[PDB]
């Protein structure tokens, strides 16, 4: 299975995260799983005209392209020319058009590629967009109706960056005959990773249940949930970040950092407008503006009051102790 991994408006964080892959690690994925990595800007040996030969052979159908991985945004500026992202003699968006049209499967890795991500933040100088989404709005660069040659839409492996498993396990599934096991949600994300929430497996959910808030960073995060004071988007964000830990170690929320909802197409949420960074926007100083997914403010607040009343003593004390 040939893989061509291109980077548009990328920071290469998805590649670096991918390189952190374990079980399989990246080398075993590239070699031992029958995935022929034709080229990758961070890893491909070919430069210049040899690299362009590889790209053109993929684009024109001279050689098969099974998986086109795209990382980074599709940069369309200036004026829709895409010349703020010139790659191998073309605007990167033209490469995207050709290769997405050539690939059996197109995988957008990372929010930039999936939805536009950080570069698509206003004022979006690069005219960045995702492959098939611009933020939540379906269509992105390739259009809502784009399908790869295997009939799939762009497989969106979101995250900023995506966790290595979010792509590697998909690649293994494709390589092991389990492509049919891959189900995609409405954002084209693999449901095997994105039916759960970041909160799922968060070490602070018991504090969340009892509405015990982390009050401060550092040692303050030895207790409490980050939802109330730090804008944790865990309960509104689909991800397996607390199921499949980052770097096989931790997750933002475990570590005391609020989930920024990076697997969600709106990321960065509120465009990091003043007062929204590591803060919970609240109505009347006590009602969160955004409640967990599938809850309403009325029920959520009633249950929150009940939980605060029922909260056991340990939920009010440090638990992630030295």
């Amino acid at each position: 299975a040939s893989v061509l991994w291109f980077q548009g408006g990328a920071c290469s964080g998805n590649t670096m995260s991918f390189l952190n892959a374990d079980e399989p690690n990246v080398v075993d994925l590239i070699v031992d799983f029958g995935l022929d990595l034709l080229w990758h800007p961070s890893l491909g040996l070919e430069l210049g005209n040899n690299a362009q030969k590889v790209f053109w052979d993929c684009a024109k159908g001279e050689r098969p392209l099974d998986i086109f991985v795209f990382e980074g945004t599709v940069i369309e500026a200036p004026n829709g020319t895409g010349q703020m992202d010139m790659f191998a003699g073309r605007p990167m968006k033209d490469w995207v058009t050709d290769l997405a049209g050539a690939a059996q499967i197109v995988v957008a890795i990372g929010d930039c590629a999936c939805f536009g991500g950080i570069p698509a933040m206003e004022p979006n100088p690069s005219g960045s967009t995702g492959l098939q989404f611009h933020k939540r709005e379906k269509g992105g660069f390739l259009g809502p109706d784009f399908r790869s040659k295997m009939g799939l839409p762009v497989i969106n492996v979101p995250g900023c960056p995506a966790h290595p498993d979010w792509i590697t396990q998909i690649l293994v599934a494709l390589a092991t005959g389990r492509a049919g096991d891959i189900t995609l949600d409405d954002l084209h994300r693999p449901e095997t990773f994105f039916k759960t929430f970041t909160q799922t497996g968060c070490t602070r959910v018991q504090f969340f249940e009892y509405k015990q808030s982390t009050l401060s960073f550092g040692e303050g995060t030895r207790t409490g949930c980050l939802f109330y004071e730090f804008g944790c988007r865990g309960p509104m964000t689909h991800s397996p970040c607390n199921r499949i830990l980052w770097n096989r170690q931790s997750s933002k929320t475990r570590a005391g950092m609020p989930c920024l909802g990076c697997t969600e197409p709106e990321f960065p949420h509120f465009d990091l407008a003043p007062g929204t960074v590591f803060k919970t926007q609240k109505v009347s100083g006590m009602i969160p503006k955004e409640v967990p997914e599938g809850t309403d403010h009325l029920t959520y607040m009633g249950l929150a009051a009940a939980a605060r009343i029922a909260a056991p003593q340990w939920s009010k004390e440090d638990m992630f102790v030295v």
Binding site: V283, S284, G294, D296, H297, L298, T299
Partner: protein, 45 residues
């Protein structure tokens, strides 16, 4: 005039003070109505 008669209450100090206080905690009204809308659209659930 009826509409100018309410426009007069708009420049009435005590009426203005109360309306400006309603515009102060407008967020809370918005959130309670949003909470009610949420509860209604989850009334089947």
């Amino acid at each position: 005039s009826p509409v100018d008669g309410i426009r007069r209450r708009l420049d009435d100090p005590q009426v203005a003070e109360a309306l400006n206080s309603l515009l102060d905690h407008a967020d809370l009204l918005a959130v309670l109505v949003k909470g009610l809308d949420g509860f209604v659209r989850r009334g089947d659930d």
